[PDB]
Amino acid sequence: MQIFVKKTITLEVEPNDSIDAIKAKIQEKEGIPPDQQRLIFAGKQLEEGKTLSDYNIQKESTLHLVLR
């Protein structure tokens, strides 16, 4: 499925990919080390450790990226 991370980027992810994997894909595109990324969805910070499916993040969601 396709999700977005807001200059918005498109990632193609499995519903069960870990937040570590999403940060790595952002690192590949943006150059930000995963440890310097704070990811938020719907006001909730997404944790290294858990998956997109744990947060009920489905297709077309837009994660919001902040630098730490």
TrEMBL record:
What CDD domains does the annotation carry? Ubl_ubiquitin (cd01803)
Provide the GO MF annotations for this entry. protein tag activity; ubiquitin protein ligase binding
Q: Which domain of life does this protein belong to?
A: Eukaryota
The subcellular location is: Nucleus
**Per UniProt, which keywords does this protein have?**
Nucleus
Identify the PROSITE patterns for this entry. Answer: UBIQUITIN_1, UBIQUITIN_2
InterPro entries documented for this protein: Ubiquitin-like_dom (IPR000626), Ubiquitin-like_domsf (IPR029071), Ubiquitin_CS (IPR019954), Ubiquitin_dom (IPR019956), Ubiquitin_ubiquitin-like (IPR050158)
Q: Name one GO cellular component term.
A: cytoplasm
User: In what residue span(s) does the Ubiquitin-like domain sit?
Assistant: 1-68
Keyword Nucleus part of the UniProt annotation:
yes
Q: Name one GO biological process term.
A: protein ubiquitination
Which protein are we looking at? Ubiquitin, putative
Q: Which organism is it from?
A: Entamoeba histolytica (strain ATCC 30459 / HM-1:IMSS / ABRM)
